[PDB]
Scaffold this active site. Structure first.
Site, PDB file in Angstrom:
ATOM      1  N   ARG A 159     -13.887   2.272  -9.063  1.00 60.00           N
ATOM      2  CA  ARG A 159     -14.258   2.457  -7.668  1.00 60.00           C
ATOM      3  C   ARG A 159     -14.115   3.905  -7.191  1.00 60.00           C
ATOM      4  NH1 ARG A 159     -10.673  -0.729  -2.892  1.00 60.00           N
ATOM      5  NH2 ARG A 159     -11.082   0.739  -1.204  1.00 60.00           N
ATOM      6  N   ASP A 205     -21.254  -0.850  -5.340  1.00 64.38           N
ATOM      7  CA  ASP A 205     -20.063  -0.620  -4.504  1.00 64.38           C
ATOM      8  C   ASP A 205     -20.450  -1.101  -3.111  1.00 64.38           C
ATOM      9  OD1 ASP A 205     -17.601   0.683  -3.361  1.00 64.38           O
ATOM     10  OD2 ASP A 205     -17.732   2.060  -5.102  1.00 64.38           O
ATOM     11  N   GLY A 228     -20.699   6.833   0.070  1.00 63.95           N
ATOM     12  CA  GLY A 228     -19.634   6.879  -0.927  1.00 63.95           C
ATOM     13  C   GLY A 228     -18.227   6.451  -0.553  1.00 63.95           C
ATOM     14  N   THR A 229     -17.754   6.927   0.600  1.00 65.05           N
ATOM     15  CA  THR A 229     -16.426   6.601   1.116  1.00 65.05           C
ATOM     16  C   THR A 229     -16.235   5.100   1.325  1.00 65.05           C
ATOM     17  OG1 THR A 229     -15.614   8.675   2.030  1.00 65.05           O
ATOM     18  CG2 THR A 229     -15.063   6.679   3.249  1.00 65.05           C
ATOM     19  N   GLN A 230     -15.046   4.659   0.921  1.00 63.00           N
ATOM     20  CA  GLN A 230     -14.628   3.266   0.921  1.00 63.00           C
ATOM     21  C   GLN A 230     -15.195   2.623  -0.351  1.00 63.00           C
ATOM     22  OE1 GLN A 230     -15.132   1.571   5.119  1.00 63.00           O
ATOM     23  NE2 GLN A 230     -14.977   3.805   5.431  1.00 63.00           N
ATOM     24  N   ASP A 282      -1.251  -3.747   2.253  1.00 65.36           N
ATOM     25  CA  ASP A 282      -1.191  -3.697   0.812  1.00 65.36           C
ATOM     26  C   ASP A 282       0.169  -3.301   0.290  1.00 65.36           C
ATOM     27  OD1 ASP A 282      -4.174  -4.035   0.887  1.00 65.36           O
ATOM     28  OD2 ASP A 282      -4.063  -1.992   1.676  1.00 65.36           O
ATOM     29  N   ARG A 283       1.027  -2.754   1.148  1.00 66.09           N
ATOM     30  CA  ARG A 283       2.316  -2.271   0.650  1.00 66.09           C
ATOM     31  C   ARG A 283       3.616  -2.555   1.377  1.00 66.09           C
ATOM     32  NH1 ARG A 283       0.235   2.199   1.698  1.00 66.09           N
ATOM     33  NH2 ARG A 283      -1.929   1.780   1.027  1.00 66.09           N
ATOM     34  N   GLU A 334     -10.554   4.795  -8.855  1.00 60.43           N
ATOM     35  CA  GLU A 334      -9.541   3.883  -8.360  1.00 60.43           C
ATOM     36  C   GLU A 334      -9.844   2.523  -8.968  1.00 60.43           C
ATOM     37  OE1 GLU A 334      -9.495   3.933  -4.059  1.00 60.43           O
ATOM     38  OE2 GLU A 334      -7.908   5.412  -4.247  1.00 60.43           O
ATOM     39  N   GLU A 335      -8.782   1.760  -9.193  1.00 63.92           N
ATOM     40  CA  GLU A 335      -8.823   0.421  -9.775  1.00 63.92           C
ATOM     41  C   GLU A 335      -9.928   0.089 -10.799  1.00 63.92           C
ATOM     42  OE1 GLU A 335      -8.113  -0.922  -5.954  1.00 63.92           O
ATOM     43  OE2 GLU A 335     -10.111  -1.583  -5.527  1.00 63.92           O
ATOM     44  N   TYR A 359     -12.552  -8.356  -3.929  1.00 66.09           N
ATOM     45  CA  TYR A 359     -12.427  -7.649  -5.204  1.00 66.09           C
ATOM     46  C   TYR A 359     -13.008  -8.490  -6.333  1.00 66.09           C
ATOM     47  CZ  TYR A 359      -9.040  -3.820  -4.117  1.00 66.09           C
ATOM     48  OH  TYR A 359      -8.408  -2.672  -3.691  1.00 66.09           O
ATOM     49  N   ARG A 372     -17.793  -7.538   2.487  1.00 64.24           N
ATOM     50  CA  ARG A 372     -17.569  -8.266   1.225  1.00 64.24           C
ATOM     51  C   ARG A 372     -17.923  -9.717   1.538  1.00 64.24           C
ATOM     52  NH1 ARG A 372     -11.661  -5.238   0.969  1.00 64.24           N
ATOM     53  NH2 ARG A 372     -12.355  -3.648  -0.537  1.00 64.24           N
ATOM     54  N   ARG A 421      -3.093 -11.584  -2.901  1.00 65.04           N
ATOM     55  CA  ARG A 421      -4.256 -10.710  -2.828  1.00 65.04           C
ATOM     56  C   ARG A 421      -4.327  -9.896  -4.111  1.00 65.04           C
ATOM     57  NH1 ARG A 421      -7.000  -6.539   0.628  1.00 65.04           N
ATOM     58  NH2 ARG A 421      -8.149  -6.700  -1.368  1.00 65.04           N
ATOM     59  N   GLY A 477     -18.745   8.197  -3.741  1.00 60.40           N
ATOM     60  CA  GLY A 477     -19.619   7.318  -4.506  1.00 60.40           C
ATOM     61  C   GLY A 477     -19.846   5.878  -4.038  1.00 60.40           C
TER      62      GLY A 477
HETATM   63  C1  LIG Z   1      -2.453   0.591  -3.963  1.00 59.26           C
HETATM   64  C2  LIG Z   1      -3.280   0.084  -2.797  1.00 59.26           C
HETATM   65  O1  LIG Z   1      -2.857   0.329  -1.663  1.00 59.26           O
HETATM   66  N1  LIG Z   1      -4.408  -0.585  -3.031  1.00 59.26           N
HETATM   67  C3  LIG Z   1      -5.260  -1.115  -1.953  1.00 59.26           C
HETATM   68  C4  LIG Z   1      -6.713  -0.463  -1.829  1.00 59.26           C
HETATM   69  C5  LIG Z   1      -6.398   1.058  -1.522  1.00 59.26           C
HETATM   70  O2  LIG Z   1      -6.002   1.132  -0.208  1.00 59.26           O
HETATM   71  C6  LIG Z   1      -7.597   1.938  -1.755  1.00 59.26           C
HETATM   72  O3  LIG Z   1      -7.698   2.088  -3.150  1.00 59.26           O
HETATM   73  C7  LIG Z   1      -7.504   3.407  -1.159  1.00 59.26           C
HETATM   74  O4  LIG Z   1      -7.119   4.385  -2.164  1.00 59.26           O
HETATM   75  O5  LIG Z   1      -7.451  -1.057  -0.662  1.00 59.26           O
HETATM   76  C8  LIG Z   1      -7.417  -2.456  -0.493  1.00 59.26           C
HETATM   77  C9  LIG Z   1      -8.397  -3.036   0.251  1.00 59.26           C
HETATM   78  O6  LIG Z   1      -8.274  -3.316   1.462  1.00 59.26           O
HETATM   79  O7  LIG Z   1      -9.410  -3.338  -0.408  1.00 59.26           O
HETATM   80  C10 LIG Z   1      -6.405  -3.155  -1.158  1.00 59.26           C
HETATM   81  C11 LIG Z   1      -5.455  -2.549  -2.208  1.00 59.26           C
HETATM   82  O8  LIG Z   1      -4.158  -3.121  -2.245  1.00 59.26           O
HETATM   83 CA   LIG Z   2     -17.438   4.272  -2.330  1.00 64.49          CA
END
Ligand SMILES: CC(=O)N[C@H]1[C@H]([C@H](O)[C@H](O)CO)OC(C(=O)O)=C[C@@H]1O
Ligand SMILES: [Ca+2]
Ligand SMILES: *[C@@H]1O[C@H](CO[C@H]2O[C@@H](C)[C@@H](O)[C@@H](O)[C@@H]2O)[C@@H](O[C@@H]2O[C@H](CO)[C@@H](O[C@@H]3O[C@H](CO)[C@@H](O)[C@H](O)[C@@H]3O)[C@H](O)[C@H]2NC(C)=O)[C@H](O)[C@H]1NC(C)=O
Ligand SMILES: *[C@@H]1O[C@H](CO[C@H]2O[C@@H](C)[C@@H](O)[C@@H](O)[C@@H]2O)[C@@H](O[C@@H]2O[C@H](CO)[C@@H](O[C@@H]3O[C@H](CO)[C@@H](O)[C@H](O)[C@@H]3O)[C@H](O)[C@H]2NC(C)=O)[C@H](O)[C@H]1NC(C)=O
Ligand SMILES: *[C@@H]1O[C@H](CO[C@H]2O[C@@H](C)[C@@H](O)[C@@H](O)[C@@H]2O)[C@@H](O[C@@H]2O[C@H](CO)[C@@H](O[C@@H]3O[C@H](CO)[C@@H](O)[C@H](O)[C@@H]3O)[C@H](O)[C@H]2NC(C)=O)[C@H](O)[C@H]1NC(C)=O
Ligand SMILES: *[C@@H]1O[C@H](CO[C@H]2O[C@@H](C)[C@@H](O)[C@@H](O)[C@@H]2O)[C@@H](O[C@@H]2O[C@H](CO)[C@@H](O[C@@H]3O[C@H](CO)[C@@H](O)[C@H](O)[C@@H]3O)[C@H](O)[C@H]2NC(C)=O)[C@H](O)[C@H]1NC(C)=O
Ligand SMILES: *[C@@H]1O[C@H](CO)[C@@H](O[C@@H]2O[C@H](CO)[C@@H](O)[C@H](O)[C@H]2NC(C)=O)[C@H](O)[C@H]1NC(C)=O
Ligand SMILES: *[C@@H]1O[C@H](CO)[C@@H](O[C@@H]2O[C@H](CO)[C@@H](O)[C@H](O)[C@H]2NC(C)=O)[C@H](O)[C@H]1NC(C)=O
Ligand SMILES: *[C@@H]1O[C@H](CO)[C@@H](O[C@@H]2O[C@H](CO)[C@@H](O)[C@H](O)[C@H]2NC(C)=O)[C@H](O)[C@H]1NC(C)=O
Ligand SMILES: *[C@@H]1O[C@H](CO)[C@@H](O[C@@H]2O[C@H](CO)[C@@H](O)[C@H](O)[C@H]2NC(C)=O)[C@H](O)[C@H]1NC(C)=O
Ligand SMILES: *[C@@H]1O[C@H](CO)[C@@H](O[C@@H]2O[C@H](CO)[C@@H](O)[C@H](O)[C@H]2NC(C)=O)[C@H](O)[C@H]1NC(C)=O
Ligand SMILES: *[C@@H]1O[C@H](CO)[C@@H](O[C@@H]2O[C@H](CO)[C@@H](O)[C@H](O)[C@H]2NC(C)=O)[C@H](O)[C@H]1NC(C)=O
Ligand SMILES: *[C@@H]1O[C@H](CO)[C@@H](O[C@@H]2O[C@H](CO)[C@@H](O)[C@H](O)[C@H]2NC(C)=O)[C@H](O)[C@H]1NC(C)=O
Ligand SMILES: CC(=O)N[C@H]1[C@H]([C@H](O)[C@H](O)CO)OC(C(=O)O)=C[C@@H]1O
Ligand SMILES: CC(=O)N[C@H]1[C@H]([C@H](O)[C@H](O)CO)OC(C(=O)O)=C[C@@H]1O
Ligand SMILES: CC(=O)N[C@H]1[C@H]([C@H](O)[C@H](O)CO)OC(C(=O)O)=C[C@@H]1O
Ligand SMILES: [Ca+2]
Ligand SMILES: [Ca+2]
Ligand SMILES: [Ca+2]
Lengths: 388, 388, 388, 388
Positions: free
Chosen positions: B211, B243, B264-266, B70-71, B195-196, B325, B290, B37, B216
């Protein structure tokens, strides 16, 4: 190319940072992966590799059953790039149930050992070709380091012992130039049993921390002098102590001179390495079994006997997960040379019994002069998912 | 070799042409393939590679179950040549559940992140060796780009944030030369959550589109100045907006200054990139999930707020197929530098439920100043054929 | 490096010698192998590779079912070294359901085609990067050679057609320098349908033998002039004839000018190549289906119409085994340039019905000025052993 | 690069040291591995490879059944690095059911043979390309060495025979320069049947020890003169004798001139090689079947007929384990050139019957002027674990 002399200061390290994990036991339940043990990692000047003595088989194989043995005609030394697990494309560099490898800066050198316990031979393979060999001198399981050997100015010094596991043995320090044994010096000093040394350079010499499988809980130190093949041996000062079985934090001692006689018999390969009068060390958190693994610096543990004032501890593997062997490995930087270490996370027979095989996977950290956090990076394989 | 300065004009692109597909989810039902992923693609001067954080397992493995996280301690950064899927011969470049990579023209650099959410460390590995590291500064999931970092004249600038996913956070922009953190500058300007980031060069600087996971729907813009580590942040002008969740074409706005506060959230990692006063952008066709993915140019979307006059749209993935993504990536030509993008086609848990695993596959297009046609290039895996 | 001009005489060949077999269909019943078709082989200056459009899947995969289709979003161009079968480590060089590749002496160039039949795009990828592209000009399955393109002095000429399979079409000859379309010339002469040309150099030009899928049983000849982009087209003189369906040895004709109108509709990719006034040619021994494959020289078949006096025949595949497509490929020697050919041994759906997949394997011979013997080298896969 | 002349003394060897094992039969019960036989090993100037004629299939494949045949259209020459088993990523260098390979110091050369027994062709492939070929001269299974050919100053001399297995045949010695047959000399001297020679350099010549499958138990010697293509043939003097079926230690003779007529018919590929007036030799310990394998030096066995005074014996494979073919191979050192040997440990049909396939694995030792011990390194595969 030029031979490596490793001359340039050891880097001041704040602690360790994660460097590579391989997940071999996890993948084995979904892919043909080798059954290995006694792994180690080392690097040529451009990149690092991962070694391990396989068990002449893959994990989802009937031949995996009963691989809880260190010695069979089929163990060969596997060599992959750090990070790529031992899949079927993996090369078996030589027949070996005990090894060591280092790269003099110009080519790799592997010392592979196989044969009857009573009369084994050790092939010295250099740069592809088989350059020399030697037979067992004490007729009792001629064995070597099981981690990276070190070379300076074209001379690689590997140490080997042959004799009794839990009694007097015969440790010899080998000097090999381009695959050729140019000299053999015998162990000297106060150490009382030297098995599987974790060695590193300390220009102009090489220093080892090994395993006393007879009367020591404290670790033997073995100092090699490349200038004249002289040898010296002692024990680490830290009253903390890093062998397993270990005694106990309150009740463990070491005078830097003699095997503390505290639960000395048995052991596990491990490492440590100085810094001024300090000692960076690692060990299974358990003192009875190989489980969990923490690291710490012992202020004054390299110079003052029975010193037990630690600082900077880190948990690499949590106390309730399997640990195993471990060893150092140096990598050269633009300005200094960092020390790194790996840890064999072993699974299968002995502790675990759902299965009949025994293999492991690794995880590797590296000194860092920077900041870091917290974690635990265990094997992570549900034993109930696993084959057999 | 020489370090890359990326100086030479951006190529005028008519739209995108197909460049590489990998079919990982399809093959997994007939071959040991990794569960990954958050993939990304980037290139050294001679060829392109594909990265992705694996899940310390293959797909037809019991350990695949519940990889909708994710972790975990086992996610490591995988790196293959663009086109070769992540099979068992694939190398795990480092332990990481959040990464970035770029090649300064002389060697690769990966910033891998693992550890407890509360106290993670980020290893800076350069040219094989571990050169630096850093700990979490806000004690709340230190995370990075999840796509290619960029370097000019030997200095690579990666951005990282730590804090609340849906609330104030702490974004820092890192300047690393040869694995060493030579400077840290904090986020500045009007952006409200970064973010990212999807970043690309724009000599003499680097520009990011990221993001906003808090307030936003419009995307934050983050402008780095390599000349003096200065930073600036804003939002994309296009009233179109990229977004997800997104609002709606008629009802979506952006003044180039503040998080439009519309759903905005998410979010989801995405990209965009200017051209004069125009904006080449991409997004899941859906504004709720998505799914599908189209791209288009918004005439005046880089300079005029709430501009929604588009031209050149293209469907890369049809509206009723899974998207995910996505990020940019630059490749240098004989005369200019083209921008390309990838799109993570994710499968498994959440939407799909026949299975317990979650992985994805990719598809990658590249700007072209030439003619092109039509198509949709989805994952293409019958979920009923698939294991679990 | 230098670009190849291919200048040096064609080698006088006595017949062909075996050169490489891959056994893909055999192994697939005991190993994850790709489902491919329309393969081809070509070589850089040091070694040869094997290409083939995969079906976005492996053979022992549920997704293999119904791969009796030439066009889906998942066909990508696979590229391995000649001899190594398309296993999971195989690289998908680009998304393509119709391709061509050649190496200008400095780097590879692939022309990959995907998209809707009605509006496909063709990406011109050169030396890793995507350098150009083009859309369908007749809106009806823009397709290319399906074998090696050829370059002289840095200019590669690939030919492509778009239009009706069994009716008038639009054939264009493309001149691409370093991934860039530097010119397009249209088909000229008397040929009446040109699909999938087998081309080779003939300094200072390139010559093609293709497939007339409309009114020809005889093969169209397409002569390209690199000096001024001029084009000419005709048909092979041999009354022997090499398309399938073919007519019959006694009842088949060709005047070197017009599609003989004998069972012209339908075809199969094949090749041939002159030598003085002679013609070295190959064809499925069957004139109804693709089965068996023999080769022979037709004395006077390159210059005299309806010439049917053959000599030197060889059976490559016996009459009662499956054949398929086939194409030429040149390799340069110390003194001249030899011509070689491959033959697609196709298995699965259509003829065979025990299974639902369709794939193939190859075999490749090369001209030799020496002695040789006899044999038949068919796929050799017991269809009853095979999956599905 | 420069062509190899191999000039520099043979190294004085004390006996052999273990060099490489591959465990193919073991792994096959847990991984897709090729079904091979008649393996051999050889090396370019930097490293060694392992060759073997596969059976156009993997072991856990239905197509494995009945691979107890030396000749089918699908046997191709496999080539891997010494140590990496023949997995699916393995390259099939050419179609061949009988081969040889050597590297002139500049490039590899393989002589691959396939076709009908009655009329086979032998392709001479040099440096990737197919440079020459030849047809069967006696119309009865044209076969070659099945081990490494040798070259000096750009000329490689391979020997080949065609005719009756157990009766008069036609042995020819081929001289090929860069893939081109520059000369053919016929066998001369007293040898009475020459099949599969094990050859090595002895500057300025090449010397072979082969298999007399007709009237000899003793081994034919074949001496090639590169200076003028002259040939000479005799038999090894040792009364010890190394073919199987062999007679018996007390009752076996050889006068260095004529096939001892003791159980002459049938044989097995083997090797030997002089040293002064001494003979280093190897053989299955059994004289009826191929089982176990020991090596020894026969003092005076190279110059005195019926000499049977041995010294230095070593067991490589114990008497009650399967042996098979075997051959020499030279590697060049900094000062001399060592001789090494491999041994085909064959499993499957004939002896073993639980299964229907037949394959093998290898083990390889190398001369050493040093000390060594004892062991036995058999295949080690529980036949009951194995597929079929
Ligand atoms: C470091 C990390 O956990 N990144 C995760 C991201 C994060 O949860 C979000 O940026 C909240 O801050 O969400 C998602 C997701 O399902 O799209 C995957 C990423 O792996
Ligand atoms: Ca958003
Ligand atoms: C793994 O290993 C052991 C031993 O393996 C070796 O066996 C020999 C014969 C040889 O082929 C070698 O290649 C193997 O590696 C196997 O252990 C046996 O398992 C059965 C389990 O039921 C035991 O049976 C016993 O008898 C009755 C039932 O029959 C019960 O009342 C008993 O409680 C007990 O279960 C048998 O004792 C085992 N033998 C030994 C020495 O322990 C094992 O089965 C094998 N298989 C697997 C999957 O790991
Ligand atoms: C995939 O994951 C879940 C959870 O997996 C973890 O399980 C723990 C124990 C640990 O071993 C870890 O390694 C695993 O990854 C599994 O879910 C369970 O599936 C059964 C299906 O019948 C559920 O049973 C329930 O009870 C009765 C029948 O027993 C029914 O009336 C109920 O409706 C229901 O089905 C059970 O609740 C599940 N548990 C959870 C927490 O959901 C799953 O089976 C596992 N397997 C696969 C193939 O994906
Ligand atoms: C291979 O392909 C066909 C079609 O495959 C596609 O199916 C759709 C639904 C989709 O999921 C896609 O991903 C697949 O690739 C399958 O054909 C069916 O097979 C059964 C066999 O019994 C046929 O049943 C019929 O009905 C009764 C019995 O039910 C009999 O009297 C009839 O004679 C006949 O057998 C069914 O018609 C088939 N459908 C079609 C359109 O032919 C096939 O099963 C699938 N599987 C395999 C192993 O190849
Ligand atoms: C391995 O090989 C043999 C022969 O294989 C070939 O078969 C032909 C038809 C073709 O498809 C080709 O591709 C194959 O490679 C197979 O041998 C047969 O096995 C059965 C075992 O029961 C024998 O049946 C006999 O008849 C009755 C029972 O039916 C008994 O009383 C007899 O004692 C005997 O068992 C049959 O004779 C075998 N045929 C031959 C020629 O030996 C074999 O089954 C096949 N399979 C495997 C797993 O190796
Ligand atoms: C490793 O090699 C170097 C060779 O350059 C050794 O150092 C040189 O060797 C002699 C001994 O004094 C002199 O030529 C130079 O003055 C030395 N110094 C340097 C900086 O080259 C070096 O000592 C060797 N190390 C060991 C442990 O032998
Ligand atoms: C960026 O890197 C390229 C390659 O090193 C540099 O190219 C030179 O460009 C200058 C003008 O900018 C010319 O004088 C040289 O002839 C070019 N050298 C090469 C190797 O092509 C370029 O200088 C760098 N860019 C900048 C802005 O300095
Ligand atoms: C990247 O490196 C180049 C080095 O060649 C920088 O450009 C040169 O640097 C100084 C600053 O003016 C002078 O030596 C030259 O006139 C500059 N120009 C060129 C074309 O080399 C370039 O500016 C650097 N880029 C950044 C963003 O620092
Ligand atoms: C085609 O390429 C080869 C290699 O570059 C050229 O070879 C030269 O040939 C000319 C005569 O044609 C000689 O004068 C040179 O000595 C050769 N050079 C090399 C490197 O071999 C050849 O010129 C090119 N062909 C043509 C027709 O120009
Ligand atoms: C391919 O390139 C070569 C370049 O060397 C061309 O030949 C030379 O080009 C011009 C045209 O006459 C002159 O410089 C030389 O006399 C030419 N001859 C040689 C041997 O180099 C060659 O003609 C080119 N081929 C084509 C088809 O354009
Ligand atoms: C065989 O090849 C080696 C390497 O090319 C040759 O080595 C030379 O040996 C001569 C004496 O035989 C010396 O004069 C040179 O200094 C050596 N050259 C190298 C590169 O080492 C050797 O000449 C060749 N053997 C013979 C017999 O000619
Ligand atoms: C292999 O090649 C070398 C070439 O260097 C041959 O030796 C030389 O060749 C002639 C013949 O006497 C003279 O140029 C030199 O005196 C030779 N000696 C050396 C040391 O080079 C060598 O003999 C060749 N070997 C064979 C078997 O032909
Ligand atoms: C050569 C050898 O056998 N090494 C083995 C070591 C040895 O038994 C001990 O050193 C007694 O001397 O023990 C262990 C062990 O279970 O940790 C594994 C090693 O493979
Ligand atoms: C681009 C394309 O579809 N090529 C296909 C070719 C084509 O249909 C024909 O050229 C009609 O024009 O037919 C066949 C075929 O079964 O032999 C396979 C090819 O993949
Ligand atoms: C070319 C060829 O068939 N070689 C075969 C060899 C041959 O039959 C013999 O040399 C009679 O001449 O025998 C054997 C054998 O079982 O050991 C295997 C070889 O593959
Ligand atoms: Ca101890
Ligand atoms: Ca036709
Ligand atoms: Ca005999």
């Amino acid at each position: 190319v030029e031979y490596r002399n490793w001359s340039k200061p050891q880097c001041q390290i704040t602690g360790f940072a994660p460097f590579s994990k391989d997940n071999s036991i996890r993948l084995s339940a979904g892919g043909d992966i080798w059954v290995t043990r006694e792994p180690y990692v080392s690097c040529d000047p451009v990149k690092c590799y991962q070694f391990a003595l396989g068990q002449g088989t893959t994990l989802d194989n009937k031949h995996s059953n009963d691989t809880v043995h260190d010695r069979i005609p089929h163990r060969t030394l596997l060599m992959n790039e750090l990070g790529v697990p031992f899949h079927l494309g993996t090369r078996q560099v030589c027949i070996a149930w005990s090894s060591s490898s280092c790269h003099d800066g110009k080519a790799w050198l592997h010392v592979c050992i196989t044969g009857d316990d009573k009369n084994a031979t050790a092939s010295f393979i250099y740069d592809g070709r088989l350059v020399d060999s030697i037979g067992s001198w004490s007729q009792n399981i001629l064995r070597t380091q099981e981690s990276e050997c070190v070379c300076i100015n074209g001379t690689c010094t590997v140490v080997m012992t042959d004799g009794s596991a839990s009694g007097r043995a015969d440790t010899r320090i080998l000097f090999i130039e381009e695959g050729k044994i140019v000299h053999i010096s015998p162990l000297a000093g106060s150490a009382q049993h030297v098995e599987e040394c974790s060695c590193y350079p300390r220009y102009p010499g090489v220093r080892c921390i090994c395993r006393d499988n007879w009367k020591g809980s404290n670790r033997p130190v073995v100092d090699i002098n490349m200038e004249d093949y002289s040898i010296d041996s002692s024990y680490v000062c830290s009253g903390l102590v890093g062998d397993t079985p270990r005694n106990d934090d309150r009740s463990s001692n070491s005078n830097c001179r003699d095997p503390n006689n505290e639960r000395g018999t048995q052991g596990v390969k491990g490492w440590a390495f100085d810094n001024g009068n300090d000692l960076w060390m690692g060990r299974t958190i358990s003192k009875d079994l190989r489980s969990g693994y923490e690291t710490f610096k012992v202020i004054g543990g390299w110079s003052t006997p029975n010193s037990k004032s630690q600082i900077n501890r880190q948990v690499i593997v949590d106390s309730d997960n399997r640990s195993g062997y471990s060893g150092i490995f140096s990598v050269e930087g633009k300005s200094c040379i960092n020390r790194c270490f790996y840890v064999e996370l072993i699974r299968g027979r002995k502790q675990e019994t759902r299965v009949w095989w025994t293999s492991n996977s690794i995880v590797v950290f590296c000194g860092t002069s920077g900041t870091y956090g917290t974690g635990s990076w265990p094997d992570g394989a549900n034993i109930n998912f696993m084959p057999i």
